[PDB]
Every structure is written in C-alpha cells, then in structure tokens.
Symmetry: C2
C-alpha cells in the first residue's frame, strides 16, 4: 500500500508513516540498519517537493536516524540523497539513505524484512 517509484511496498516492511513521509527497511542493506526514508508523494527530484514535504521528510529522517543508531549500536550516522541520474539514483523517488555507523566499518526474505521492521516499529510507539 506504499509505493517507492515503480515498486509497491508492503506495509509490513514500512516502519513509520508520517503525515507526508514514510520509512522502510532496505531489501539490500549496505550496513545493518540501512534504512531509507522517502516522501509519500512519488516525486523524482528533491526540487519537485513542496516546502512542507521537505520539512517532513527530513524531520522524519532525524527520528529514523536516531532510532537505527540506537538499535544497531552505531556510534554515528551517514545520510545521503542521490538526486537524479548522474547523482546515482536508480529508483526514481526522492529517498534519504540512513546508515548507522561504527568504527572501522568500511536480497533478503520478505519475512526477515518484516521482522526487522516490527522490531524498529517498537521505538516509535
């Protein structure tokens, strides 16, 4: 019931849904707790977003960031948005990448994904 570009994503994978934004667990994390926040509206470029969507996206990204930093024992975080092709974008939907980071740190089952989600979902209760 959520859409991330072309793909439609199952609620039981989405671990937060705000008034205009939503977060989901990655189905190919780079580092554990690699989650991604994106606006509900399917825009392709950061600039097509309204001012409020922007404020909601990054506020939610603040929270989501804190949470996955706690749960995956990362000491710090790394945020990154690939805005348009040539930036590195693949799926055409504004999305913030969130990576919990530890020291010297340099697909997946749709039942495992749903687990990591319900697990995270607990912190926003």
């Amino acid at each position: 019931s959520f859409r991330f570009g072309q793909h439609l994503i199952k609620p039981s994978v989405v671990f937060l849904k705000t008034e205009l934004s939503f977060a989901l667990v990655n189905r190919k994390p780079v580092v554990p707790g690699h989650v991604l926040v994106c606006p509900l509206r399917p825009v392709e470029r950061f600039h097509d977003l309204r001012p409020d969507e922007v404020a909601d996206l990054f506020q939610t990204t603040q929270r989501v960031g804190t949470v996955v930093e706690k749960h995956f024992h990362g000491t710090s975080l790394t945020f990154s948005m690939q805005d348009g092709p040539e930036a590195g974008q693949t799926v055409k939907h504004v999305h913030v990448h969130v990576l919990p980071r530890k020291a010297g740190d340099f697909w997946r089952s749709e039942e495992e994904m749903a687990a990591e989600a319900a697990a995270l979902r607990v912190y926003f209760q």
Copy 2:
C-alpha cells in the same frame, strides 16, 4: 561573523543566510559548486537540532541545491551529511554537502572564494 565549528567564516563567502541557516562556498571543493549548508546554531549532531532548524536547514538545502545545479551545469545533485565521528565528520557542526553532478565526472584564495559567492548570491536576490 558566521561560525562553522571552530572556524569563523567571513560574510563575503556566505552566499545565503536564512532565519536559522546559512550557506557558504567550500574552501576545498571536490567538484565545482561543492557548497555546504549548515545551521546558524553550532550543534555537532543532527539530533541536537530543533525541529524547525531541521526544516529550515533542508529547505535552504533544496534552494541552494537547485542554484548550484544551474550555475555549474550539473545534470543532477548529491547531498550528503556526515553525522558525527565514524560517519566521517571533521569539523563539528551539522553541515549538508551539496554537489552539482554531471556525466562521467567520477585550498583556494579568499578573494576567489568571495567571487564564487557574490556570483551565487545573485540567484537568491
């Protein structure tokens, strides 16, 4: 009259100053038009920022992004925040990195810097 962590930065280098945020030209760009937006308040971690500071930071980052994309003929953009040590942070102040990106793309004088600024300053007029 602006401070970025330990360093104090000269107005004539800062190319936008909003109610709570400000942008400046980099004094060691990775790619031309590598600019950085940061909150006026000297916090060290994304989470210490108030909700409004967050909304203002990334709204301003939307604008600043568009502008440097136009002026440096980048086809797309890349945003990146290094939140805390282990993330990669060096100067301890929340700052968004903005990079205008073109295809196959893989210090500086305080008079040159001031030029690139006044130049950018023109788009926000």
